[PDB]
């Protein structure tokens, strides 16, 4: 059991494939070139070619970068998608199309005063009878959004053809008269700029009775990360969550027999980004000096975990885990109702008892009370 706790990755940060936006004149620009914009839609089209989740290294389910998944249901093997819209067009006159190149006598105009258009409706993403055989999954990283956008004069784009232009054409064809991404009106114009306006997005994870392990994505854009929250519905299984040093709001709906494990190794350690991935360093001094425990809320450094459901259960313990050495694991046994914790050190008996002094120093460096400690030898 604590063995399963101790049994609980070079995955990239969010945006390595979809792009990480930039703040330009006080608004977020995801992409600012026609070909870059088209490439974003090409990336999105992967959800159709590969499904909403990819399987990396035959061990972990990874959603498409920037795909808005609003619900994951492990009971019904299903997904719900959130909002991924783009502003519609109105007006224009004399529309024709020649060689799949739209032409206008007078060009249409983009408006935020009429209903926006669903990009995902034009993809037709499979959301049912999914394979949730892998018990490790990276959580989705994408809040709902409406893409504001702009056209500009862009010549030489008439021969561009790929899965991105196909998807953009699919949007045009699905909402006739309301979307044109490349068109001639005395000059050649095209979409040049993608400007997401993100929306608060709660992602509901409906768990089954099984062992489910979750990796929280590393989202380096504050304005994206702050629109996201995860809400887990416990079903009495064994659940682990690897928290990111870039925190995301998380609520846990506790069921009677849930075993919850939170891997805090990123939260207690120096973090930097190298080659699009997390680089872990040494432990942070006093990072756990003010753990805040309440029946409905746990505060661990920059992490805030809210709790609902069976929150008045006096008998439940949850566990925080991290690595002190390459051979010794620290488990923080937390009772939310008692507002209390104790410590468990786990490792090989010979090694652990040898390095006991060193290990208790690390605990004290982390800011933890070292007064209640149990020892589990392997």
């Amino acid at each position, epitope marked *: 059991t604590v063995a399963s706790i101790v049994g609980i990755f070079l995955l990239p940060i969010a*945006g390595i494939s979809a792009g990480i936006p930039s*703040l330009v004149n006080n608004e*977020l620009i995801l992409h600012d070139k026609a070909t870059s914009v088209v490439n974003y839609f090409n990336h999105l089209s992967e959800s159709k070619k590969y499904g909403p989740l990819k399987t990396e290294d035959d061990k972990i389910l990874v959603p498409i970068d920037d795909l808005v998944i609003s619900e994951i249901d492990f009971n019904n093997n299903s997904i719900k998608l959130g909002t991924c819209n783009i502003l519609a067009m109105e007006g224009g006159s004399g529309h024709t199309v020649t060689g799949n190149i739209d032409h206008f006598f007078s060009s249409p105009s983009i408006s935020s005063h009429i209903p926006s258009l669903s990009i995902y409706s034009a993809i037709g993403i499979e959301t049912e009878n999914l394979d949730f055989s892998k018990k490790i999954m990276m959580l989705p990283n994408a809040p709902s959004r409406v893409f504001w956008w702009e056209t500009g004069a862009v010549p030489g784009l008439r021969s561009l053809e790929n899965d991105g232009t196909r998807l953009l054409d699919s949007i045009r064809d699905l909402y006739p008269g309301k979307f044109y991404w490349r068109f001639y009106a005395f000059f050649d114009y095209a979409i040049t700029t993608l400007k997401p306006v993100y929306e608060d997005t709660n992602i509901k994870i409906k768990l089954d009775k099984d062992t489910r392990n979750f990796i929280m994505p590393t989202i380096t854009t504050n304005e994206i990360r702050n629109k996201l929250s995860y809400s887990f519905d416990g079903a009495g299984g064994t659940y682990s969550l690897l928290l990111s*040093s870039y925190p995301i709001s998380t609520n846990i709906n506790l069921s009677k027999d849930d075993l919850w494990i939170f891997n805090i190794d990123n939260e207690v350690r120096e973090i930097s980004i190298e080659n699009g991935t997390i680089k872990k*360093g040494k432990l942070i001094k006093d990072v756990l000096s003010k753990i805040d425990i309440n029946k409905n809320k746990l505060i661990i450094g920059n992490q805030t975990i809210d709790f609902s459901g069976d929150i008045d259960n006096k008998d439940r313990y949850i566990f925080l885990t991290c690595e002190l050495d390459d051979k010794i694991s620290l488990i923080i046994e937390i009772n939310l109702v008692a507002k209390s914790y104790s410590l468990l050190l786990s490792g090989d008996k010979n090694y652990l008892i040898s390095n006991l002094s060193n290990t208790i120093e690390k605990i004290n460096t982390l800011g933890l009370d070292s007064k209640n400690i149990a020892y589990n030898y392997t």
Partner: nanobody
Framework: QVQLVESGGGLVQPGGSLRLSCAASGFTFSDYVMTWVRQAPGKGPEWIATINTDGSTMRDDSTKGRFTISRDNAKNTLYLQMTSLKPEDTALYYC???????????????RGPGTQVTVSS
């Protein structure tokens, strides 16, 4: 006993650059990671960046390039280089000890009074 005091703010014209600094005393500076935060009225505190004891950094990528955190351990000083300032950057900028990113962690941080940065037209 811990002291943190920021300097370097002021009225700046749009497009200008500014280097903030924070002097520290009362603890072993090099043993801590250090954070820059900014706070404008009507918003929560905004985490800018944290610098590790090895000089590596963790940062918000919307501040990417324009804001750069650095440290000089011998001078017990944290720096924030700011580039191409804009009116939306107007806030009180302050230093916090440790890695403080969430609102509660920032509001409970060991921090300096801040240095005001005002960019306007």
């Amino acid at each position: 006993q811990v002291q943190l005091v920021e300097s370097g703010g002021g009225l700046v014209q749009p497009g200008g650059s500014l280097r903030l600094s924070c002097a520290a005393s009362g603890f072993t500076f090099s043993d801590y990671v250090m954070t820059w935060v900014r706070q404008a009225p009507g918003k929560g505190p905004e985490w800018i960046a944290t610098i590790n004891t090895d000089g590596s950094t963790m940062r918000d990528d919307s501040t990417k390039g324009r804001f750069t955190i650095s440290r000089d351990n011998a001078k017990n000083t944290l720096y924030l280089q700011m580039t191409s300032l804009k009116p939306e950057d107007t806030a009180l900028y302050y230093c916090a000890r440790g890695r403080v990113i969430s609102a509660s962690a920032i509001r409970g941080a060991v921090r300096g009074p801040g240095t005001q940065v005002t960019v306007s037209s």
